[PDB]
Every structure is written in structure tokens, then in C-alpha cells.
Amino acid sequence: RVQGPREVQIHLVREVQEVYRAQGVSIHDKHIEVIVRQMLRRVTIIDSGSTEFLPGSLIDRAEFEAENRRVVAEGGEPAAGRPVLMGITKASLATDSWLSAASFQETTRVLTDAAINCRSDKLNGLKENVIIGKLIPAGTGINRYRNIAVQPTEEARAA
Amino acid sequence: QCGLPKLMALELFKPFVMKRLVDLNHAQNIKSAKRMVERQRPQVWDVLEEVIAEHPVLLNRAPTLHRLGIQAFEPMLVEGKAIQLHPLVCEAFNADFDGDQMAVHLPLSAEAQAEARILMLSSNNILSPASGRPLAMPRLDMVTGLYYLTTEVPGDTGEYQPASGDHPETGVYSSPAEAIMAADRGVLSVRAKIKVRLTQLRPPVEIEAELFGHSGWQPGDAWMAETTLGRVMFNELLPLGYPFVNKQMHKKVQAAIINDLAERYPMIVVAQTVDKLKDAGFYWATRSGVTVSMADVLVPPRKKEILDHYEERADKVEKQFQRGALNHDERNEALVEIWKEATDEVGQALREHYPDDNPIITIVDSGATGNFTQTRTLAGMKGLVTNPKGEFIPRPVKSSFREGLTVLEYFINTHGARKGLADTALRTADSGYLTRRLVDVSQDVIVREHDCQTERGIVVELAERAPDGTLIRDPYIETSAYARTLGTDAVDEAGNVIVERGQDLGDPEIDALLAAGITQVKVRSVLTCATSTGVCATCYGRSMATGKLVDIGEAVGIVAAQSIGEPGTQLTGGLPRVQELFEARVPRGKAPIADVTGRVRLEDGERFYKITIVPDDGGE
Amino acid sequence: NNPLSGLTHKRRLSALGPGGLSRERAGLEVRDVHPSHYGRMCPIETPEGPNIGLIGSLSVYARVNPFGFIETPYRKVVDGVVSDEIVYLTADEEDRHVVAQANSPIDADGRFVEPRVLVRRKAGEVEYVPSSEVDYMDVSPRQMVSVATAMIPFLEHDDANRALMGANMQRQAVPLVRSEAPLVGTGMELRAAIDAGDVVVAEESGVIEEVSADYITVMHDNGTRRTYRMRKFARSNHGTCANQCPIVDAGDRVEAGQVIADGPCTDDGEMALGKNLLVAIMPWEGHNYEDAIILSNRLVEEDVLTSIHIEEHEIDARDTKLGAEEITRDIPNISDEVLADLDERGIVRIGAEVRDGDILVGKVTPKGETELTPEERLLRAIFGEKAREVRDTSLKVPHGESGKVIGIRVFSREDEDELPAGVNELVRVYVAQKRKISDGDKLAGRHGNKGVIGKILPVEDMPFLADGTPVDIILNTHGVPRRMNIGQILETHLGWCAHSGWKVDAAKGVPDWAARLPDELLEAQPNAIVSTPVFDGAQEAELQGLLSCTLPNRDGDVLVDADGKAMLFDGRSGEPFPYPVTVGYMYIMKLHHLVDDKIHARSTGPYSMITQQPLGGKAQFGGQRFGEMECWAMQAYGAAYTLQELLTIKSDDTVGRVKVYEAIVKGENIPEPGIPESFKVLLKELQ
Amino acid sequence: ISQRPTLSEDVLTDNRSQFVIEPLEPGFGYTLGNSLRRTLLSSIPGAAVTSIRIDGVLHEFTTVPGVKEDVTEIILNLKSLVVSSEEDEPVTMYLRKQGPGEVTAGDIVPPAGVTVHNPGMHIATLNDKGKLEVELVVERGRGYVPAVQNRASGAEIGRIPVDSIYSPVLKVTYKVDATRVEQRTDFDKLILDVETKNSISPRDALASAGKTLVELFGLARELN
Amino acid sequence: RPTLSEDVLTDNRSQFVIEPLEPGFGYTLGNSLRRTLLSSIPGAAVTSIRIDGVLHEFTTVPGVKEDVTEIILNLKSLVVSSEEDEPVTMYLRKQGPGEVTAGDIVPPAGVTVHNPGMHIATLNDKGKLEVELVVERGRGYVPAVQNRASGAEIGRIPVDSIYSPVLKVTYKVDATRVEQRTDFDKLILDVETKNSISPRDALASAGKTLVELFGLARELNVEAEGI
Amino acid sequence: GYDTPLGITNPPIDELLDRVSSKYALVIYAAKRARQINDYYNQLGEGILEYVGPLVEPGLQEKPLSIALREIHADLLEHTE
Amino acid sequence: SNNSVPGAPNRVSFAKLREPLEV
DNA sequence: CATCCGTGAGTC
Ligand SMILES: [Mg+2]
Ligand SMILES: [Zn+2]
Secondary structure: OOOHHHHHHHHHHHHHHHHHHHOOOOOOHHHHHHHHHOOOOEEEEEEOOOOOOOOOOOEEHHHHHHHHHHOOOOOOOOOEEEEOOOOHHHHHHOOOOHHHHHOOOOHHHHHHHHHHOOOOOOOOOHHHHHHHOOOOOOHHHOHHHHOOOOEEOOOOOOO | OEEEEHHHHHHHOHHHHHHHHHHOOOOOOHHHHHHHHHHOOOOHHHHHHHHOOOOOEEEEOOOOOOHHHEEEEOEEEEOOOOOEOOOOOHHHHOOOOOOOOOEEEOOOOHHHHHHHHHHOEOOOOOEOOOOOOEOOOOOOHHHHHHHHHOOOEOOOOOOOEOOEOOEOOEOEEOOHHHHHHHHHHOOOOOOEEOEEEEOOOOOOHHHHHHHOOOOOOOOOOOEEEOOEHHHHHHHOOOOOOOOOOOOOOOHHHHHHHHHHHHHOOOHHHHHHHHHHHHHHHHHHHHOOOOOOOOOOOOOOOOHHHHHHHHHHHHHHHHHHHHOOOOOHHHHHHHHHHHHHHHHHHHHHHHHOOOOOOOHHHHHHOOOOOOOHHHHHHHHHOOEEEEOOOOOEEEEEEOOOOOOOOOHHHHHHHHHHHHHHHHHHHHHHHHHHHHHHHHHHHOOOOOEOOOOOOOOOOEEEEOEEEOOOOOEEEOOOHHHHOOOOEEOOOEEOOOOOEEEOOOOEOOHHHHHHHHHHOOOEEEEEOOOOOOOOOOEOOOOOOEOOOOOOEOOOOOOHHHHHHHHHHOOOOOOOOOHHHHHHHHOOOOOOOOOOOOOOOEEEEEOOOOOOOOEEEEEOOOOO | OOHHHHHHHOOEEEOOOOOOOOOOOOOOOOOOOOHHHOOOEOOOOOOOOOOEOOEEEEOOOOEEOOOOOEEEEEEEEOOOEEEEEEEEEOHHHHHOOOEEOOOOOEOOOOEEOOOEEEEEEHHHEEEEEEOOOOOEEEOOHHHOOOOOHHHOOOHHHOOHHHHHHHHHHHOOEOOEOOOEOOOEEOOHHHHHHHOOOOOEEOOOOEEEEEEOOOEEEEEOOOOOEEEEEOOOOEEOOOOOEEOOEEOOOOOOEEOOOOEEEEOOOEOOOOEOOEEEEEEEEOOOOOOOOOOOEEEEOHHHHOOOOOEEEEEEEEEEEEEOOOOEOEEOOOOOOOOOOOHHHEOOOOEEOOOOEEOOOOEEEOEEEEOOOOOOOHHHHHHHHHOOOOOOOEEEOOEEOOOOOOEEEEEEEEEEOOOOOOOOOOEEEEEEEEEEEEEOOOOOOEEEOOOOOOOEEEEEEOHHHOOEOOOOOEOOEEEOOOOOHHHOOOHHHHHHHHHHHHHHOEEOOOOOOOOOHHHOOOHHHOEEOOOOOEEOOOOOOOOHHHHHHHOOOOOOOOOOOOOOOOOOEEOOEOOOOOOEOOOOEEEEEEEEEEEOOOHHHHOOOOOOOOEOOOOOOEOOOOOOOOOOOOOHHHHHHHHHHOOHHHHHHHHOOOOOOOOHHHHHHHHHHOOOOOOOOOOOHHHHHHHHHHO | OOOOOOOOEEEOOOOEEEEEEEEEOOOOOHHHHHHHHHHHHHHOEEEEEEEEEEOOOOOOOOEOOOEOOEHHHHHHHHHHOOEEEOOOOOEEOEEEEOOOOEEEHHHEEOOOOEEEOOOOOEEEEEOOOOOEEEEEEEEEEEOEEOHHHOOOOOOOOOOEEOOEEOOOEEEEEEEEEEEOOOOOOOEEEEEEEEEEOOOOOHHHHHHHHHHHHHHHHOOOOOOO | OOOEEEEEOOOOEEEEEEEEEOOOOHHHHHHHHHHHHOOOOEEEEEEEEEEOOOOOOOOOOOOEOOOHHHHHHHHHOOOEEEOOOOOEEEEEEEEOOEEEEOOOOEOOOOEEEOOOOOEEEEEOOOOEEEEEEEEEEEEOOEOOHHHOOOOOOOOEEEOOEOOOOEEEEEEEEEEOOEOOEOOOEEEEEEEEEOOOOOHHHHHHHHHHHHHHHHHHHHOOOOOOOOO | OOOOOOHHHOOOHHHHHHOOOOHHHHHHHHHHHHHHHHHHHHHHOOOOOOOOOOOOOOOOOOOHHHHHHHHHHOOOEEOOO | OOOOOOOOOOOEEOOOOOOOOOO
8 A cells, every 4th residue: 555566476475585584595576576466366356337337346447447447438437446466265266267266275165155156167177177087277278288289390201 | 207106006007908908819808817816817918018108106205395305207117115206306205215205196187197108207397486496406416426527627637738849749639539549548637627629519509690790600610629528428318409518517606507497599509408317417426436434533733722712712712701790691602702713623623624625525526415514514614503592602512423422522422413303394384384375365366367457557667776876786686577578668768668568578678678777677576467367367377387378277276385395394583484474473683663754863872762654745 | 913013003193084174284393303302202213205204103102181281290300409309391391401421421429510501402402511500310211212212222323314214114023933032222112112002011919820821820829810811813903813721830929010921922911023033244245235135044934024814704695685684505507616615504614724715604695686698508408407596705815915724713694793773794804924034024123124035045055154143134235324323333333242152351350431320231141131221331442341241152163253244155156255244233123024924916806886997906806097197108218009008998998908818818909999988978977 | 665475374164264365465465365255255166955855744834743943943944054065967866764853964875976964963853753854955156045946947846945055164354564664564464264164175265266356357367 | 149240430440339228237237348448459659858948938939820838739649550569759840831730750670650641730931840759568557757758858748648549448237128027237438549540440440459357267166158 | 419219219309390280289290190000901891991101110019109100200291270 | 339239240330339228 | 462262183
């Protein structure tokens, strides 16, 4: 609230680092930053506006700026948003897939809420796919690499 | 490669062997071929040898703390019922040989084996994905073995001698083949400094320019050197095309060479080069003469002299507290300082008293293993022990383990030793839990694009400005800048650009900016680059394992989690601090920060601190 | 496992169990070493795992008072004068008093030497206190330790971390074919062996009237005769070999309380937990890198580290709904080559050899009259062989097991042997193995120096001394100073002096270093036995001096120096090693972590009844577990197809794993995985 | 700068004999006496017991009524039995002794071409009413051959396969006197030390050692 | 199964593969065959030299590019076969601009130089060079201090004598799997020789030599062995 | 310039990686060709129209993956994403 | 000796004389 | 900012 979302990221990364520095551990700032990035992907709802966003709800920046891109084109009031920092535990629970959430912690709580909200799960993630037995959506599992046709060059020919 | 027991593999490849048994008509069908393998008929040992041909298997060693916890190997049939493992990958598995087991998983599908041999093969995973440093490097016997021959011994026999009087120059040899025959006769020491003409080793870059004018050194071009016989044998492994190194091989030295080989030279060169180093390390660790005796471990000469000095300085503190001029909190606080100082002076008493021949110190100072703090405890004294509270006991263990601790001493050291084992078991549980939280939070983070294209990055302090002039390298250089890719052209005072945008920062590309004078660079970060799902490739930059730009599709989110949790066992803030940060808790310290910049108005009270800040720009 | 193993177990002090605490409830205070534990409960002996500090052993000299507290012996000092009168004190009672340390110098009458002595006080505090204030003093220097702990020579030279493991591992020692007493002792090896109960002690005095390998008869003084029967080749709780052998010959005069016949891990009434090995402290071609161990093949050709392991195999015949299980020699579709080692009943014959897969007890059961396959109906009309209604339910030898059948125990409901409701014939076949030591077998010393056997070279490859004798075991130098357990070094020095023998120079008087050395040790024979009691015994000055006293071999040459080192010849290259290597004798134990048990694998096998996943354990022939941690490693690599396969066609895909087995044996390509049956379970559990 | 064909001297003792070989190349003595030492300890042909049988015994793990030792300790006592046979094929020995008293290697009855070299060797102390009828099988071989191999051949259930230590060699070593005096007087003198089992002579052991090595080094001389 | 002998080649050096050895005989054969090729094969080399314009070593020879040191070394690498055991003397003289080689040497009768193209020293104009060489015969390697009195004390220089015609030999011992036994030994041997003799012949001579040694032992009884 | 690659390190992966976009791509690239080669051998026995056989000489009892991985190095295959 | 009570093998001991009480 | 209930607390 004092120095903005970018500064709080730089502070966390170096304060975290300072602990591994003292004990002689060397982690590249890169890896830390990946986790840090996932903590700030949500912004809170100050004013509901015309949107269907419940006030006092942590919603993704992608969703927040795309719904405020649809209502802006609709003519209604856009929701006022303030950036919010989340601990990795609850950020993890707040995931889009209830499968991933229930298979993390507080399984009885995850299901109770998900069965009420009628949340549908798009099985598009790592934890999601492993459970159902699908190929994981990373590495050699993505269609870019998965669907490859290999053929002999026209030069290559049976003897 | 890895040694796979003849018994294990036969049940692993059981339906693959049954297949070829009925192929070569040893069995008439699939039912009888099954019976052959179960009865273990002598035929199948020839068949199985053909089946496992370049069919990789997995070696898992729990706990799987990072992805190098599971690596692939080319299976090698071996007599016996134990798995045989390469001495280098023990740094990755964190596996010793005090009874450790390993799980084995055999890939079946055509894609799986392809994934194993290419992605998961141990010879491709040489570097740590956490730091980019070598893990598959000389470690224990190997380092001590190499450190042996590359050491320069002053007065050793066969040493080079200048010409004077009636005798010419002693210690100059025509070729390495000659110096070999000298030590075989017993004239030359493999550790003595001599002069030799070499014909198959590229000279130092500083000397190649002097002797050839960088005409391009060639296999056959000669040049004279001033090293030892051992340092020459060592450089035949690196081998050709790599500049000679005339130093003694401390671990940090060997860490540099491999890390350079990782950069320039290709993977299959490094894998083979490091292999040669291992064979050399062990043979020479043998004839290193590194042995522990009761004689090699010596108690200091000023042992009782020094301890009498500080016990006299202690009795003075006890009597100064006896008169009550010292606080009880101050009494022990001073007693701690006295004996801390004492222990140090005992260590100094060892270093100079101990020959560099001493195998206990030879192992410590060469980075092979062990700390000198262990050597102090062994030969000097144990020192202060920890209270159940954690505070250091006012009473000191004056005895070393060589002399034999007193009965009461053993008791209080034991107490600390146990609570250490208890905590080492409790942090691990905390470390693994933090790990699983980190994995779940960054699972949707994958490299999906090749570039976000945004010009957004973040500033990194390259170097501090030294007061007298020139500069000083920042301590955070290695971990914050060295793997990044630039987000803006780096210019000096001139209009001349040193490094472009879209350029990966390498080792010499840091020196190009370090000598130019620029101390701040803008770099593409994972934070800044914004894409739809996950992140881009360019922003993330150089994958610490490949030494090159990260491939599109790598689950950098999970690797990051592993790379943070893996070494979490080695902490004292500490590990709770690490949790307190990633879970965004309102901290214990709760130190206040300035809301608006301005002039500070300190107004301390003895009962309470109060801080006022007059706003720099008007304000209230 | 061994006699000590049992002895220790009876002296355990757990805080677990009903009325006590749970494992998760115990904080960090319950576990650590308390001051009052001195002389009552050991601070060293405790498990390494999650049970650490919650389990301990009772100190040697302690006992329990009628109220359930722990008392401990102290010597009573009247007024600076030690008195042989002893009183047992409780924890809080001792706190009200003041106790002197055992090793404090005492006058030949009973008085102290210095006015101020070392003093133990309430709350674990210690100070110097005048001799007028001394109430009690310790019984022994080794008063605070436990039974297994006091068996660790030079304990005060090893750090509590490794010394802990040094105590724990002794309990894991394996009884060898025959056992030798250690060259270096602590004195505790005797009383431990006797009080174990796994040796044979004479009740009343007399003379051995008759001795056989079967039993010993003792003729008392009053005339009565007591006969002691020998436990011969019995299987212990843990498959080790409890085998007893008569010590005394016929006609020996034996007094009461004397060991007349000892058991496994015992040599002349002493705890023989291992063998005396000729050690060499050096790296050797890397084969001992990271705590691995190199052995001489002499230990394989002379069975020095060879053990016997007995297994009990069981199977029964019950009353079913389709009839009753009968034990017969007639098993459907089996040749007479397989049945060749059975008798007429269906039981294997004693002395026969058994490998894995072979048949021990032939049993067949009436299989349900379900419609046999129309394709197998057709197959039974061609060859005209009518199907039997009896399925093979035989007791075959489990994977890995093998050996000689050393006995049969049969219980029949027919022969009035009382059986549980439903059982007719019950058979017990006992099979022993003669396991020589091999690669991967975990060895250890008493100083927390563990490790597995990396390689066993031929006897000639071994680094040998000047007289030709090859060393037995090659330990790596690197893994010694780190562990702080250099008591293994001192054991090697004293161990060599004990093998060669020695003689202090008495000319020009008794030397100043060997002045505290009791008379009986100033001259020692080759292969002598000695005691180094914990917190007493040998000191570094006497050890160094004794290394100079080392008697020459048969050729009249001394083999080691005053440093304790010696010059070795590399058995491979022939050339002498450049530097002197520390050589001596060490006591090495065979621990119960053998590869022959540890090794295991599985292609396909049994599967879970609900989750339809593989079963778990070597006993059930189950596959390994690819856990949550391992699925992260895969995910990190980006090996989707490997990860998918492991959790689909390698696991609980009902239709997949069968069609994978077929695709392999036909040599085709691996099909595409389906739906994990476990996931179907979840969607039904949610419903 | 000197040429002299080498020698092979001998300084004797009953069980062990010192061989002296000189003059050899400078720094050659060590890696030459070692090549003999490694040939002696591994590949010198001798003879020992392979399998046995006892009356009333079907396996190694039991006791004979009336005897102080068990079959395990008895078989383990017979490992130090020193035998020399000329019969290239297996031969059968016999030992039968009853009543009180001690049985030894002397009571063994070696057939034609078999000799026991240590009759005073203790086997078992047969107390009263104790009878011991044994049946030992002797073969010729080299090195060390484990018991476990005999059983699968077809050996009947009566037989108890025993470990075989054919190696008649006991202990081998050497020392070298290298004259390093600065001159053309630089040579090495080898002193080989060989001790046997009283199964063969120390000389006969060095002879079979050389015959082996000569035949091995003859393949480096043959042309392509 | 009787053992085989193999050869992988190069002009000056080659590798020899011996398999299958009875378990434990690789090392038994290893270092014993290496120390034979390096020490037990006779040849000829330079014992001492003499230079005209030299009264001490530190100053280079008048009219020569190379130092006194680098010429000794080049001369050490000279390969020579003498026919008589007794020490012979050859003269090498040349003057003017150009380069002096091993073909300029004037050799005695029955004394052959096998690498006449070897560079030795680069003379300039007004550069005079006269060198007396002392050639002996022997085995292995002999230091310089032992040859400090083999020339006239008016500039006699002791040289390291490399009599042996074999330059450098290494060996590795892997394991070959015979029958079911994976214990059998496989001996790989790397041998590099001078331009005087072929490696394939240097081994046969080194092989014949050792057969003589083990003869002494065998002579006593020739009891038993099987191939 | 290196030493002769032995066993499963051949063909050298570095040169393999020059002919492909990333490590991941090479896997499916090779494996899908390894599938074609094993089809050809099983199909040919009873089926026409199989995928083109080994474009290089098959080593004695050479694994189908090991065949594919070599002809990728021979640039005898076409690459599509 | 150390434990001269049962009829045991003689194990000589480096020791200060221990006569308080048997184990 | 401090209590009461429910849920977490490394792997093989
Ligand atoms: Mg371990
Ligand atoms: Zn981006």
C-alpha cells in the first residue's frame, strides 16, 4: 500500500534470499520470482460496479481486466480494484480447478463449497491431468510437440 | 551406466525375455517360455543380455527433493544382488553407501525410453537446476587424489636446478614420455617443479600469444613449461584445445574448470572429460598417503598454557561477580566471550604446528571434506555446548576427543547432540511441507510462448562505486543478474552500446559491462513479462541446467519449488522466516516503514521510542 | 537377532503406550537428556528415527524401588573417607545431597587427595567443593551408561552422534557359523553373555559325567544329576541361528555359575558380536568411496563372516464348500521330475534341496464346478483328457528363498493333534540357508562406523604387509575425522598390540609412561585379550608406548612402527605404497541388513482389491510406490508419457496392463492408456 | 651399461624357501616377484575334499549321537585337512571309529595315490557309545571352489557338498635389494619367499607357477 | 578357452587386446609387461656432447637461435642405432645461414640415424657450429649426473641417455563375460615406440625376454598347466 | 573434436539438438519414427503399404529407437510441428 | 583381571581398582 | 489486538 506491487516483489525476493545467503545456500533469484509472481495475480473488489464480482473477493487480474473490458463495452460501471498479496497456501486453494484444490488441503471444505457453487472443472493443468490420467499440459505433452509427422526426405528412398 | 543385478533385470524384462525365447525357439509358446524364466534355465542369461541392449532404466532414490532425484541409466547386467551406482551422481541423489536402497522403474512405451535417454539421462543432467553449478564433479577421494599431484613441493627430488660450476642444468626433460621414465627409475617426483617441452597441449592464453602471436596452436607445436609432472598428466584429460592450467587443484579450482567446460564445450565432451577425472582421482587418492593415525592427530603444544590464561581471566570475572559489581546477565555474557576467544587461539595453535603433510589438514584445506572446526574439536577442544534453551553453557568442554572427554563432559555434549538430531528431523518435515505448498502454487506456470515482447523489466545493481574510485563487484551479482536476458540495450557514457537487447548475460558479457563502467542494467524478469497463461521463454532466460535458453514447455514453476526446498535442511530468521515470507504473514519483528519521504525527527524516550517525520514536500 | 539383542529389549524404557503419551503429543522437552538420568537411564542409547528420546535403556547399576522410581548406587563418604557401605538413592533425594565423581583420587585408606574435588549438584550444576562437604561419590566411572553402551571401547573418544549408532547397531548383529571373542574388550562382554540366558550356566557344582553334541550331564557333589540339553539349530524370532555347543570336555571340574556351553555370538562365555579383522585405513581405487567397504576373499573362503538363516514355511488344509483340501503327492499337470523330492504324502523329504518356484507341500483343492471354457472344452475332446475338479493350491518356495530342508513338523486332526475349527492337516517345513558374505551386506564396528560391502577382491589383490599377510578389510580414510569417532582408530592401535604381543622395557627401571600401567600388562603374549572399561582403561600415552613394544613376527621382524603405521604393497601393481598406512586389528560385526532379503522386483503380480493398484511389499510381491514427490520430478523434467504410463498402464488401468503385456510378448507397440480405475472409484465415492 | 643373464638361487627351510634372483633391471624386482606371488596364491593346482557323507545324516545341520561336535563343526574342522592326490579323477576315502576316545586324520583311510600330511589333526571327540562312519570324496583342482556347485549336478540327498580350498600355497612375499650406487653398478636383487601347506614343496610350487606363466607369455612372441 | 591377441593400429603406435585372461591375471600381467618394454629392450643414445664456442652453459652458442638447453633436448629426441657396444663418436659441423638437421650428421660405420628430418638448430649468417657427440648403448633411462666424466673437460656436457627404443606405455584391464562368468579379464595395452622399431616387434622382443625369466622356475619340474 | 561416443551416448546429443527446436520436440520426433519402424517389421510379415523401412543399415538386434536416432543424425527425415 | 568371579577367561584390564560392587 | 474449533505438520 506504500510502495506499490512491484516494490513489494523486489523486497520479498531479496529478504527471502538473505536467509539462504547466511547459511551458504545459492538459489538464483529467478526461481524465487516465479513463486512471487503467483502471489500477486489476484486483485480485490473495492466497488462492485456493474460487474457480477462480489465485493471483498480475490479475483484474477486476467479475469478482472477482461470483465472490465466487457462491461466497459457494455456501458456499466467497472469494478474498482486494489492489488492484494496472498500467501502461497490460500493462493493455492483459490485455484480454478476444484480437483487441484481438494487434492491439496482441507478436502472436506473444498468439496462443500464447490458442490454448492456448481463449479465446473476444465481439466487443464498439471495436478488436474495427472489424476484423470491425461498427458500433462507441459513439455512433451503439449500438442505443439505431441502432434508431429515425421517423414523421409524425398531424397531418401528404398534401394 | 548403472549395474543392474542379473536377478532384478530378469523379472523386470520378464515379458520381453519371454518374447525372444519363443522367437529363437528355446520355448514352443508363451506358456512354456514363462516356465523357462521361472526355473531360471541357463539359456535366458544369454537372451536377457540382448534384451536390455541400450534399453534405459530409472534409478530413484528417496527422498526425491529435486528432479535429479530420478535419473536414467544404461542398464549393465552384473553378478550379485546389489545395484551398482556411479560415484558422481551421489551428489544429486544425496545417497551414501551406509545401507541405502534405490527404486528402479523400467520405461516401456517408445516415447518413454526416448524421454529417458534424452531428458533424464544422467550424462545430460550435469548441472544443478538451482544454481547452474556442477553436481557431477569430483567430491571426496577424487578431489584429494587430484589435489595430491597438482601440488608444488619445494625441495622434492628431481626438481629443476640452474646450471653452476661444472654441472649443467638439472631437471629439464624433452617430453612427458621422458619424465615418466624418470619417476619410474626414482629420479623424479611427480610433485616437483621442473621444465618440460610439451607437444600436445595448448599453452596458456597469455603465453600462446607470446609464442605464436595467436597463430593458432597446433597438435605438434612445442613450448616449454614450468610445472610439475602431475600437473601435466592432469591436463591431458581436459584435454587438447583447452588452455593449460598451472595451479594446484582445490575443489573451487575444479569447480571453475568444469563450469567453463559446461559453457563452451558440448555436453558429450564434459561427460567424458569429468569421467577421466574420476579415474585419475581414485588412483592417486590411493597413492596419496592420506591416513589417520593417533600420531597424525596431535594435541597443541600450548594446550595447558593457553587454557590456564583464560581460566585465570575467568576466575577474575567470577570474583568480580562475587562482589556483585557484575550483572548476572552480564556475567555469563562475558564468560561466553572469554572461552570463545580461547577456542580460536587453540585452532591457531594447530594450523602452524600441523605440517601441511598432515592428512587431517590435507583433507580439510583442500576442500575434499570436513571442516577445521571438526579438526579443532578433535585435536584442540570441543568448546561451548548448547543448553536445552539453546543458549551457550557458561561451562566449557576443555577436553578434545583425542585426550578423552571427562564423564560429565560427555553427558552435556550428548544432550546437545540429541536435540540436534531431533531438530534435524523436524526441519525436514517442515521443509517438505513448504515444498509441497510451493509446488501447488506454481503448477499452472509453464513456458508457453517464445517471447512476450514487452519492454518491461527490472533494475539490477551490477556493481557498487568504490569511494577512492573504480568499483566494486556487487555480492548479489551471481544470483540476480548472471542468467538474465536484457530488456534494454546497455550503454556506457558514450553512445556506444556494449550489449544488445534480447541477449543472454554470460560470464564475459558481465565483464564487458563491468569494465565499461555501467553499474546498472535493466533485465527481463518473470515478474514483468506478461502473457496469457504461464510465462514466456525469453524473460525467464537461461535454464540453469542447459546453459542455454529454456525450451518452450518446461514446467519452470515446479523446478523452482524443488530448487527452493531441496537445500532447506541447512537453516537456523531461519526456515520459519522462509515460511513467514511465502505465506505473507504479518511478521514478528513488525518493523515500521516511512509513509512519506522527508526529514526524520527522532524524539526518544526511555520508556518508549517515538518517531516523527516532517514531509519533504509540504505535507503534514 | 543376537543374545545382546534380547538382553537389551528386556531393559527398554518407553514413554509410549496406553496411559503414556502419543508420538505427536511429545514435544522437544520429553526427548532430550535430563540431568537426573545419570546412573539411572542412558543418555546415549535411543533410536535414530521419529521415536528418538522416547525410548531408552536402563543404566547398568540402577534398580527399581517399590514405588516405581529409579534408584542408583553411590558410595558413602563419612568424612573425606570413602566407605564400602553403599546406599541406593532416588532422583530427588540425590538433589538434596552432594556427589563426587568416581575417578577422584583416593587414599589407600579411603581419604581424598585434594581438598577441592569435582562435585555433582542439583539442577545439573557443577562446582569445586572442599572435602569436608562431600556426602557421596559414584560407584563406577561407567555408572551412567547402559549395557550395550558400556561395550563400546574408547567411548569417550567418539561423539554422541556416532556413539549412539554404535550402540543401536550392536543389537542388529548376526550370529555367525562360529564366533570369536573381540581382541579388544571392555569387560562387559562376560556379564552380558551370562545374563542373556542364551548360554548354558551350571546350576550346582560338580564334574561333567558325560558330554555329547546333544546334551551335557553334570554329576553334583551330593549325588544328584542334572542334564542340560543343547538348543541345536533352532530358528529364532528373526530367522537367525540359535545354536549351542558344549564348552567343557568330559571329566572337567566345574563350579556353580560357570558357563559350560555357550550359544550364538558367544566365545567362552563372552558376547562375540563379530570377528577380529586385519584393517587398513586408506582409500583404495575408490571402491570404498562414501563409507563403502572392501573385503578380503579370505572372509568368503574361510566363512569368517558367514551366517545361517532359518525360515519357517507354513500351509494348511481346510474344509471348503466343494469338499476339503487334501495334501497329496498328486498335483494336476506336473511331471515326476518336479515331484521327485517329495515323499508319498506330498511333503518334501528332509535334507532335500529347494530353490524358488519348487514345491514344498503338495496341496489340491476342489475348484468350483463352473462351466469350463468352450475353447478349453474343445481342447479336452481332441486329446481326450478329462478335466480334474482339483486346482493346484500347493506351497511353493517364495522368490529369493533357497536352501536345505532341515525338518518337518506335521499336525493332523486325524492323529488327535488339536487344531483350529476347519483345519485337517497342517505342515511346517523348515529351510536353512548358509549365506556367505557378499556385496551389499551391511557391516559395522562398535563406533558408529557402518557401511555396505562395495567389493570383495581376490585374496592376492589385497594390500599386504612385508611378510606377505593380506589385510582383511580396507576402510576409507575420509570418513573418519568427520564423524569424530576416532575411537575406531585407538581400537586399531591397541588391536595390533594385542595381536603381536608386547613387553615394556624394565631395564633401567619401569618407564614413566607405563607407570600407571598395572603389573599384569607389562608383558603380553601374541593374540592376547584385554579390557578398556569406559571412562577408564587405556590412555593415549600408554597406547603410543605400547606401539613401540610390538613384538616381531616369526621372521624376527617388527611390522608396524611407533606411529602405528606400516608399509603396504599394492597387490595389483606390486610396487610399495608411497606412504606408511595405519594397520591393525578391528572388531567388525555382521548386521542384519542383507541384500538377499533387501533385493526385490516385479513385472506384474497381485493387485489391490479396491483401488485396483499394485500391492505393496516384498512379502506380497508388490511393486514400488511412485509417490507425490516422484511425480514432481517427472513433471519438472517434462516427461509426460513416462509419467502417464506409470500411473495408467503400469498401475490401475484394468484393461490397459493386460493389453500392455500382450503388446510386449507379441512385439508390437505399446497401446494408448485408458482411464485409471482409481479415478472411477473416486467419482463413485463422491456420488 | 652391462649385460648378464640372470640367476635363480635358493636358501631353504622345510616348509618355506627363499629364492634369490639377480641381477635384474633397475626398478624391476618388485613388479616381477609380484607376478609370481599372484600366480601362486590363485592358480597353483592342489587337492582337497569336495563332498562327504555320514551314516545317519542327510544334511549338514545335525548331530551324531554320542559325539561332542555337530556336523557343521566337524565339516568345518575338515577344511584344514591337508591332502595330496595324483588321481586326476575323484577318489573315495573312509573313516570308521567306535567307542570312547578321539578320532583324527590318521584314522582316515586314503586309497591308492592319496596321502594325508597331517594325521594329528583333531576331527571329533567321540564319547562312549558314539560311532562315526564317514565317507569323503577327494578331487584335484586349483584355487577356491565353493560347495554350492556340487548339489545341482544330481548328487543324491545323502551327500553334503563341502567348500574346496585347492590352493596348496600358504603365504608369499618378497623384498628387493636395489644397488642405487651412482655407476653402471645399478641393479636389483630379488628375494622371493614361498611357504607351502606340506602338500607340495616350495620348489614344486614355483615350478608350476613358471610353467603357467611361460605358456602365457609365449603368445606375445607369436607372429600375426 | 585359449586366449587371443589383437591389434588396432597407427604408424608409430598401436593398441593390443588380450582376452580372455583367467580372473585376476590382467593385473598379474599388466605392470609386469609395461616395465619390460620400457626397461628391458636395448638400443643406443647420446651420452655426452661437446660444443666449440662454449665455456659455460648460460650463454647461447655464437650464431645460434636456440639456447644451449633447447638443443640438448632436440638432441635427446635423436634416434640412433649403433652396432658396437663400445662408445663411438660422430661429428656434426655446419655454418652459414639455414637450418641444421639430423641428415647433416656424419655417422660412423654401423651407426644409423633414423630421423634425418629432425629440426635441431637454426643458424644465421656468420654462425659457426661444431659439435662432438658421444654414442653408447644400454637399456632404459640413465640420469645426467652419472655421465659427468665422459668427455674432455674443455666443455664436456653430460646428457640424459634414453637408451630404450620404447617411448611410452599405458594399460587398462576391463572384464569380459565368458560363458556365464563375467569375471574373466581383458587386457588393453597402449604402446608407442621410436622410429627405430615397430610396436608389433617391440612387444615380441619384450615378450620373448620374460619367457626366459620364468624359465628358471619351470626348469625344476614342469609339473602341470593347461591351455 | 572429442572421443568416440560409446553405447547410448551415440549419436552425440549436441548434433542431434542442432536439427531440432528443443529437447522435448526431439523425443516425439524420434519416438514416432521408432513406432513407424516397428510397425514396418510387424506389418511387412502380413501387410503391404507399411511405413518406409530403416533408411540406414540396422545393427545386429538394434533397437528401433536406436535406428531412428541415427537417421535423424543423417538428416534423412523431415520435421513438422 | 576384571571379573574374577565365575571361572572365565582372563581378560587383563587397564584400570583403577574397581571394588565397589559387581554388576 | 487476544480466545475456541478444526487442520494442517518430508520421503522411501
Ligand atoms: Mg544413508
Ligand atoms: Zn514474457
